[PDB]
């Protein structure tokens, strides 16, 4: 009675034809016998090679970011450019962009509203830092990030929204997340969605875990009642990613 | 001294689709100009693969519109190393739009340029002052502050692969209309500073491109200026008339 899981690969700022081609070919060979939406997010530069070569029908290609409009924005890629290319999924609000690249709550919320308006599926990332977690602000922070996005969306747009929780407090700090800690946050995120949008939207919403996911820990994470799959970092650049997809059975 | 090899560079900014860009690429493949000029086209990252495959005019190099200094956990960004591996060897850095909206501070631009030069890139380094800065009498102050941040991280040898583009931000989307004479004023002060810091040879060889409003109407008026070595072109580079702009560097 979980909704359809998602196994998503965030390749981040990594890649080359030598690295990615064998990886894509492996995914093409992978068969799953369960209903799962798979997603790969290459850098913008590798999207064309990935679209040309990825043949597995259970996969969609996503961008790792987008801006809201085409125009005089040197360096950036807009949603409209992506849509014209045939890309219909996008990751928005990733912790790395919130930290280093100017993704404020308001900027993320506007990107999400426009992506949804243009027909995109969106993986919206939320997560608290170590200072925030230790101040006891975990719930407040992730719900503030979520509410900013939610305020702009009509009910129907939620069918194309996916949330990813990133335990930012666990990167480089000495801290390490457990599945039960992830479950606690996934659960409070869903309860807020339930309170705002109703039981059906909450039950069908995919909330993916975006902390460190490996073939070693994926099965135990997916066992948690409110975890609907993964936004995977480093392991998604490796053949072990196939086993991670398998753990969403 | 005599001008070095001119550059005509197209900055497509955040624009493009197969229907828009293919006609432009084929217009350039069909162009007949044969003088010594380095042409550059800077597509979005998404359109770099198509452009590389389709653009066969050997007078062109493809550039990225931005890059970061290293691969890694930088979701949404493209690194110099990823571009180098793809066969891209030109990059635009410090564009006014990035300085204004996308966090390109003077120091961040300087580190990007230093890394780019070390990775074998030719770099179009953008500088320029706003309307407020010009009114305050800070034209020279602002462009030399931006350029000096970059220069502090460069070896003398790196300069062979450096190109400067002056953007009169004060005249872009404002009621102000920059004249070729005002452009020449800034290009001259830039070259004077380079000459004083690095010597006659580096200054003589350096390309300083004008990155204000360049059209097929005004391109020759600008190239006639002594210290203007070509263009970084915005809107007009999304039109067939960019061919006439290249012809203006004769």
From Swiss-Prot, chain B:
Q: Which GO terms describe its cellular component?
A: cytosol; glycosome
Q: In which pathway does it act?
A: Carbohydrate biosynthesis; gluconeogenesis; Carbohydrate degradation; glycolysis; D-glyceraldehyde 3-phosphate from glycerone phosphate: step 1/1
Keyword Cell cycle attached: no
> Where does the protein end up?
Glycosome
Its Enzyme Commission number?
5.3.1.1
Going by the entry's taxonomy, the superkingdom of the source organism is recorded as Eukaryota
Q: Which InterPro entries match?
A: Aldolase_TIM, TIM_sf, TrioseP_Isoase_bac/euk, Triosephosphate_isomerase, Triosephosphate_isomerase_AS
* Main subcellular location of this protein, as a coarse class: other
Reaction(s) the record says it catalyses: D-glyceraldehyde 3-phosphate = dihydroxyacetone phosphate
Which residues are recorded as binding substrate? 11, 13
Describe the protein's quaternary organization and the partners it interacts with: Homodimer.
HAMAP family (UniProt xref): TIM_B (MF_00147_B)
Q: Which NCBIfam families match?
A: tim
User: Mind telling me what this protein is named?
Assistant: Triosephosphate isomerase, glycosomal
């Amino acid at each position: 009675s979980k909704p359809q899981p998602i196994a998503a690969a965030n390749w981040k700022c990594n890649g080359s034809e030598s690295l990615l081609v064998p990886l894509i070919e492996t995914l093409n060979a992978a068969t799953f016998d369960h209903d799962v939406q798979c997603v790969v997010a290459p850098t913008f530069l590798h999207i064309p090679m990935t679209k040309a070569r990825l043949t597995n029908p259970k996969f969609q290609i996503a961008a790792q970011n987008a801006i809201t409009r085409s125009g005089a924005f040197t360096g950036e890629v807009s949603l409209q450019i992506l849509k014209d290319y045939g890309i219909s999924w996008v990751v928005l609000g990733h912790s790395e962009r919130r930290l280093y690249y100017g993704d404020t709550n308001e900027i993320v919320a506007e990107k999400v509203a426009q992506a949804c308006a243009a027909g995109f599926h969106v993986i919206v990332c939320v997560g608290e830092t170590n200072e925030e977690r230790e101040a006891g602000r975990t719930a407040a922070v992730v719900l503030t990030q979520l509410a900013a996005v939610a305020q702009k969306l009509s009910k129907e747009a939620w069918s194309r929204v996916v949330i990813a929780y990133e335990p930012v407090w666990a990167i480089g700090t000495g801290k390490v997340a457990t599945p039960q800690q992830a479950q606690e946050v996934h659960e409070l995120l869903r309860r807020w969605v339930r309170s705002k949008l109703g039981t059906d939207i909450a039950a069908q919403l995919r909330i993916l875990y975006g902390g460190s996911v490996t073939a070693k820990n994926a099965r135990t994470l997916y066992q948690m009642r409110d975890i609907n799959g993964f936004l995977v970092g480093g392991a998604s650049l490796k053949p072990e990613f196939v086993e991670i997809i398998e753990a969403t059975k």
